[PDB]
Paper text:
Rationalizing previous biochemical studies of this medically crucial interaction, the structure suggests that the epitope adopts a rigid conformation stabilized by its involvement in the C5-C7 and C3-C6 disulfides, close proximity to the N232 glycan and hydrophobic interaction with the C terminus of another subunit within the UMOD filament.
By combining AlphaFold2 predictions with X-ray crystallography and cryo-EM, we show that these proteins contain a bipartite decoy module whose new fold presents the high-mannose glycan recognized by FimH. The structure rationalizes UMOD mutations associated with kidney diseases and visualizes a key epitope implicated in cast nephropathy.
Numbering used by the authors:
A (entry chain A): 25 to 587
B (entry chain B): 444 to 587
C (entry chain C): 25 to 444
Write the structure that this text describes.
């Protein structure tokens, strides 16, 4: 009407400018008051003519228009005024925290943390046990939310915490929140009264109960600690939850002192405790997994006399059975020598023993040199105790190794020298000795000595042969052939063969031989004869073959010259 | 109050010798046997594989050769005798003896007379304490 | 006077008791003082009346009288006092050692050991060469006296000491005092440079000079020893004396080492060396007694080819000429076989050869049996060397004997039968 602009420059920044066919009209929108060329800031809620907001609706000016805002929980619908609608079904009329539930109320909406939780509905700072089952209140970033302990716990792998571990110094003041124990640290909280100075702490803590069944929710359990002689004098209250996969999680809070620490039993994940030494018999019992020695090491005095020693080329070692020390009450063993820089340590080859080493010289590790003319000797002392201090008995083991000063040494590699040798062949013709004798008796006792003898036909002529030399046991005497001759000349046609072809002659039963080929003594017996003719003298000649018993049988097995 | 119990242990040092090829005593052999000629020079040295104390010196009390591995054999050819080198042959030499742990004797090859083809080497040795004994062999000469 | 005893019991044991007609008088003798019934011990030099001992004479008491003793060298003569007299003319005023001379001196006598001796005249410890000629200081019992070495020496009959003897092991540290060499041990100390490893010792000692003439006194002589290649590098000094009967005696002291020993040459007491083999021609020369082979055995190669063999009925022998071995430089011969229990030794029938024996069996002495159809054979090897070890050449002699397996035998005794 009266605000017809010539150009858009006559519209302000508080009015909307509209160009229609290049004709500029300024019309100032609701929430600004005036004619339209100039409209200054003034709420549409208070202008001549007013607006159209319902009775409850508190008119609010906006830069460009006007809005009818009802008491939050109701919204103005045209022709109806304030009408009921949920405000927690619109993601722009509600922004409550992820764990806060929205509740539309008359005039606003409230954000409400769930039952148990303690908060305003913007941070739902829950307390232990204030969550529903399966969830626990744990921090996440900078707020506290209900999360399952099986996904929000920490883990602990402190080997020291082992009950047998008696050395060290600890304090569990750091521990808060849920924790788990995996690996060396053990599988579960200790459930038994633990001795003093165990679990690397002064006073050990243990669980006063039995772990719940798998997937049982958070349950509270009693906790006990041991000191002096009274076990579980003061009683606490810890909480424990089982998780799927067979493990547990625990609320390990700082103790009331600085010498209290929780313990764990051995995992014993293997049915048979093969980790334990072969000399510490494993006890394979249901629910009772451990290992201990048999009766042999259940006695005190003989254990005090028990030991073993080993002298090496460059080092000396003395060792005692750890089981024996444990049986003598020395669960922890302290081995010291004349020089404190040398300290005992585990065998690391056979775990039963515990041993210390000493270099075989004078000056290091306190070893000395005792020498005499025969051979040198090294002497050193071993000190045994249960702790640093000694109260009742101070047993010192005096040991020594003897090293011989004179010994045999042999070079192993033999030698095969080469020499230029000259060989020249030499040969020599030789001759054995053979002789025969004429005996008188059938027992072959006296030889003759005269150049000639006289005899009768009826007389029996016993003769034997012998070797005056070369009486080898394996060389036998074999009569290849024997014959008689009228003259000393061997080459005579007139021969009377007596032994022929290794067999005795026939046509006369007096031709006998007692032995032939058996041994060196060959005897033939025959009664006297005379050559036919002018021949008065008769001689005896023989040929003989020496027979080797190794190869030839050399018995004449003459079945008979006839047959 | 203290309890004392005596304990004793028999021990044994380690001693070994090697057959070197060079006059510089560089490479030991490893085979169980070797072949050589008479003109070849046989260089041998001894060492302690353990207990190398600075004051313990190596002294050759006597060395000898044997045709067989058996030490108790009547046929012995003493090379080192009474801490002094053998005579009747100028090739019998020792560079060091008693000075330190490295004792070396040099001699050229020989062969036993007879059917004996193989020759072995044996030695006896006395460890000498430098604190008291001089342990130098000052052998003016086995002859004179 | 006032000591008239009624009986001898009133005389003491310090007074002399005299019975005259059964009247007992006690008079105490000089050296005891009193009245006579009791006289207690007191020197007589101070009694009422003094005494009579010469000025020089010390007033000495004796058990029974008072004596006067002068400075030993003078003796108290009555009326004169101390009078000069020799004390070494009385066997009771002198007891000097048998070799000590007595000298009477003013106030004593002295016993004097002779010139050279070092003693007090009680124990004359003489030293070598401190005696007069014809005598030397040697122990006798528990003292040292000057005695002739020809009657106080020891003797030695060690055959080993011979120069040719090259085996063995010795040390002359025991030898001290005078010694002689008789018999096999030789007649006199070696006078020539001896080769190495001789006289059964490592280094041989010899005399550096020529023995003195018979009955020349103790004379010192140079001594030499041989080692390595240098002969008489170090020089000592020995002493030697000739004795009647044509032999010598020597001062053999321990050497400075334990491989030194004196040698002797061959005695050769026989003009011709008949002991030497008939194949080692004796050299009958004045002052040069030995024996060596002729030119036939003065060559090396043919000697290496030279040998002889003998096959016996039960034993086999191989031998080589010892002269040939010596010519080949093998002065000592070492013969070994396949079994070391067999060792060579001297022939003992003809001394020229050296031989070894082997029983004709299999198993002893390493002999084996090689057999074929014709006749058996025995083979064995001989090893030769100069010493235990072999350095340059190892010559082994292969020898064998052939024993026929078929042979002719004849009964010697003929027969003369009787027939009707
Ligand atoms: C069953 O068993 C029996 C018993 O074992 C066997 O019989 C034996 O057989 C052996 C093997 O033949 C014989 O050994 C040889 O003996 C001869 C000498 O024999 C005589 O002397 C011995 C001892 O007294 C006697 O027993 C034997 O009977 C002979 O006696 C009489 O000798 C005269 C001659 O003077 C005869 O006329 C006579 O008939 C005979 N009487 C008989 C037979 O009753 C010996 O000389 C032989 O040595 C030769 O061989 C060696 C080995 O090769 C050589 O040594 C080597 O020499 C090399 C060169 O220097 C050297 O480098 C090498 O290192 C060296 N080796 C060693 C190990 O030392 C000898 O030097 C030598 O060399 C041979 O010499 C002969 C000459 O003698 C050469 O012959 C000549 O040849 C030329 C041509 O080239 C011409 O033709 C000439 O005319 C000819 O003369 C020959 O060539 C040379 N060889 C070479 C150089 O290679 C050897 O020791 C046993 O004696 C014998 N025993 C008996 C009792 O009979 C029988 O055989 C067995 N039967 C069966 C079936 O198995
Ligand atoms: C040069 O140097 C070398 C090197 O040092 C010297 O050689 C060494 O010498 C040492 C001193 O003698 C020896 O020590 C002794 O060793 C024996 C055991 O020796 C054997 O074993 C060792 C180790 O393996 C080995 O080296 C040695 O060679 C021996 O091996 C062999 O053993 C068999 C036997 O099984 C032999 O048959 C065999 O021949 C042998 N081989 C050989 C020799 O080559 C050890 O037993 C000794 O201990 C004894 O002495 C201790 C000190 O007194 C006692 O301790 C004390 O006991 C008291 C009681 O309980 C206690 O109250 C006290 O507090 C305690 N003291 C201390 C400090 O602890 C021992 O108990 C023990 O007591 C003696 O025991 C023996 C038996 O063994 C008794 O002898 C018996 O006596 C009765 C009569 O009464 C009958 O006659 C029995 O028949 C007889 O057997 C003896 O009486 C007991 N004495 C008591 C009770 O007082 C000691 O440790 C070294 O081994 C030796 N080394 C070598 C390599 O040889 C050498 O000598 C030097 N030379 C020179 C010149 O200087
Ligand atoms: C692992 O386990 C260990 C051991 O449990 C945890 O460490 C410590 O645990 C204790 C015990 O939970 C905490 O102490 C206090 O716990 C109460 C619990 O109250 C909430 O849950 C109630 C239901 O819970 C039951 O079950 C639990 C066991 O799970 C029992 O302990 C309970 O007693 C119940 O039986 C619920 O009923 C509560 O609401 C009502 O009651 C309480 C009564 O105290 C009222 O306040 C409420 O207004 C309401 O009416 C509640 O939902 C907490 O409420 C305690 O909060 C204290 O601290 C707040 C801030 O620090 C403070 O704002 C509170 O007002 C209150 O402080 C006041 O009251 C205390 C009463 O003891 C006084 O101590 C204090 O002086 C003051 O007067 C408190 O949290 C330890 O805090 C806790 N310590 C740590 C370091 O965590 C360990 O946390 C576990 N690990 C985890 C969860 O990861
Ligand atoms: C076979 O022959 C062998 C080889 O000769 C004998 O073996 C050893 O021989 C030697 C040499 O004789 C002995 O050594 C010493 O000898 C002197 C000799 O002195 C006496 O005689 C002097 C004259 O002799 C001359 O001729 C001889 C050769 O025949 C020469 O050796 C001499 O040098 C002369 O040339 C005479 O003059 C001496 O008196 C004076 O001079 C000496 C100088 O040394 C002074 O002492 C005297 O006081 C005096 O002034 C003397 O009469 C000995 O005197 C030696 O005695 C030593 O030992 C005594 C005890 O052991 C000791 O009391 C002495 O004091 C003296 O020891 C001192 O002097 C030594 C000098 O070398 C030092 O060595 C020593 O360190 C110390 O300082 C000594 O005896 C060997 O002893 C002797 N060995 C053995 C084992 O016998 C062998 O004996 C003969 N076999 C027999 C006789 O059967
Ligand atoms: C050393 O020995 C003790 C026990 O000593 C044992 O009993 C003594 C009275 C003597 O007879 C000893 O010679 C004998 O070895 C071990 O301590 C433990 O003692 C208790 C005591 O009651 C044992 O309990 C018994 O066990 C048996 C078998 O199961 C039951 O039948 C009984 O009813 C009772 O429960 C316990 O077994 C035992 N522990 C063992 C043997 O390991 C000590 O441990 C042992 N030391 C060594 C290193 O072996
Ligand atoms: C001033 O506020 C009151 C509430 O305090 C208003 O009364 C409300 O009026 C609306 C509109 O009719 C009602 O909504 C209705 O709800 C039913 C049930 O959900 C639905 O079916 C209808 O379609 C409609 O949405 C609402 O229930 C009612 N509230 C009460 C408590 O009765 C009143 O209208 C307001 N004044 C003005 C001028 O708007
Ligand atoms: C004190 O001692 C001295 C000697 O030191 C005495 O003088 C010695 O007197 C005697 C006796 O007259 C002398 O002996 C005489 O010797 C000669 C020669 O042999 C001989 O012919 C005499 O017959 C007599 O034996 C002696 O020589 C003399 N000595 C000296 C050195 O003159 C003196 O008499 C002594 N006094 C007393 C009181 O004993
Ligand atoms: C324009 O307003 C009329 C009348 O509403 C009246 O005036 C308003 C400013 C406010 O004061 C109301 O409460 C007054 O009633 C709306 O018509 C409806 O009128 C009835 C009768 O009173 C009333 O009950 C309803 O709530 C009104 N409907 C509404 C306010 O939506 C008319 O609908 C309004 N036009 C719109 C909002 O576009
Ligand atoms: C007894 O004594 C007289 C006198 O000797 C003097 O008195 C001695 C004890 C003694 O001291 C002497 O030296 C005194 O001279 C002996 O007569 C000799 O007198 C002279 C003169 O003095 C004197 O030189 C002589 O040596 C004396 N003769 C000795 C002492 O033999 C008298 O001989 C003595 N009677 C004896 C010894 O039987």
């Amino acid at each position: 009407d009266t605000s017809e602009a010539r150009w858009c420059s006559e519209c302000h920044s508080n009015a909307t400018c509209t160009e229609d066919e290049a004709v500029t009209t300024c019309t100032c929108q609701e929430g600004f008051t005036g004619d339209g060329l100039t409209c200054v800031d003034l709420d549409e809620c208070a202008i001549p003519g007013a607006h159209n907001c319902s009775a409850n609706s508190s008119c609010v000016n906006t830069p460009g228009s006007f809005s009818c805002v009802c008491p939050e929980g109701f919204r103005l619908s045209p022709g109806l005024g304030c009408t009921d609608v949920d405000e927690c079904a619109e993601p722009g009329l509600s922004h409550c925290h992820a764990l806060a539930t929205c509740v539309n109320v008359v005039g606003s909406y409230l954000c409400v943390c769930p039952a148990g939780y303690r908060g305003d509905g913007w941070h739902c700072e829950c307390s232990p046990g204030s969550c529903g089952p399966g969830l626990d209140c744990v921090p996440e970033g900078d707020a506290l939310v209900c999360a399952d302990p099986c996904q929000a716990h920490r883990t602990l792998d402190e080997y020291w915490r082992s009950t047998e571990y008696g050395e060290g110094y600890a304090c569990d003041t750091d521990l808060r929140g849920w924790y788990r124990f995996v690996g060396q640290g053990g599988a579960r909280m200790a459930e038994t009264c633990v001795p003093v100075l165990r679990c690397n702490t002064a006073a050990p803590m243990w669980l006063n109960g039995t772990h719940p069944s798998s997937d049982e929710g958070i349950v509270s359990r009693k906790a006990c600690a041991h000191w002096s002689g009274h076990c579980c004098l003061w009683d606490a209250s810890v909480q424990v939850k089982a998780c799927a996969g067979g493990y547990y999680v625990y609320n390990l809070t700082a103790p009331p002192e600085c010498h209290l620490a929780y313990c764990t039993d051995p995992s014993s994940v293997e049915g048979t405790c093969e980790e334990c030494s072969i000399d510490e018999d494993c006890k394979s019992n249901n629910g009772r997994w451990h290992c201990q020695c048999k009766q042999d090491f259940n006695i005190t005095d003989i254990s005090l006399l028990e030991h073993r020693l080993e002298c090496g080329a460059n080092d000396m070692k003395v060792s005692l059975g750890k089981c024996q020390l444990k049986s003598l009450g020395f669960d922890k063993v302290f081995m010291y020598l004349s020089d404190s820089r040398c300290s005992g340590f585990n065998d690391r080859d056979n775990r039963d023993w515990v041993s210390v080493v000493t270099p075989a010289r004078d000056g290091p590790c306190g070893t000395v040199l005792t020498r005499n003319e025969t051979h040198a000797t090294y002497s050193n002392t071993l000190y045994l105790a249960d702790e640093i201090i000694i109260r009742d008995l101070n047993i010192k083991i005096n040991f020594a190794c003897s090293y011989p000063l004179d010994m045999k040494v042999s070079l192993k590699t033999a030698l095969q020298p080469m020499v230029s040798a000259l060989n020249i062949r030499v040969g020599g013709t030789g001759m054995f000795t053979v002789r025969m004798a004429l005996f008188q008796t059938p027992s072959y006792t006296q030889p003759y000595q005269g150049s000639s003898v006289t005899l009768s036909t009826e007389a029996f002529l016993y003769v034997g042969t012998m070797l005056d030399g070369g009486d080898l046991s394996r060389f036998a005497l074999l009569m290849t052939n024997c014959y008689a001759t009228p003259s000393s000349n061997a080459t005579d046609p007139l021969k009377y063969f007596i032994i022929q072809d290794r067999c005795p002659h026939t046509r006369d039963s007096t031709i006998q031989v007692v032995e032939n080929g058996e041994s060196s003594q060959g005897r033939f017996s025959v009664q006297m004869f005379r050559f036919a003719g002018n021949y008065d003298l008769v001689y005896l000649h023989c040929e003989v073959y020496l027979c080797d018993t190794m190869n030839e049988k050399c018995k004449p097995t003459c079945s008979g010259t006839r047959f």
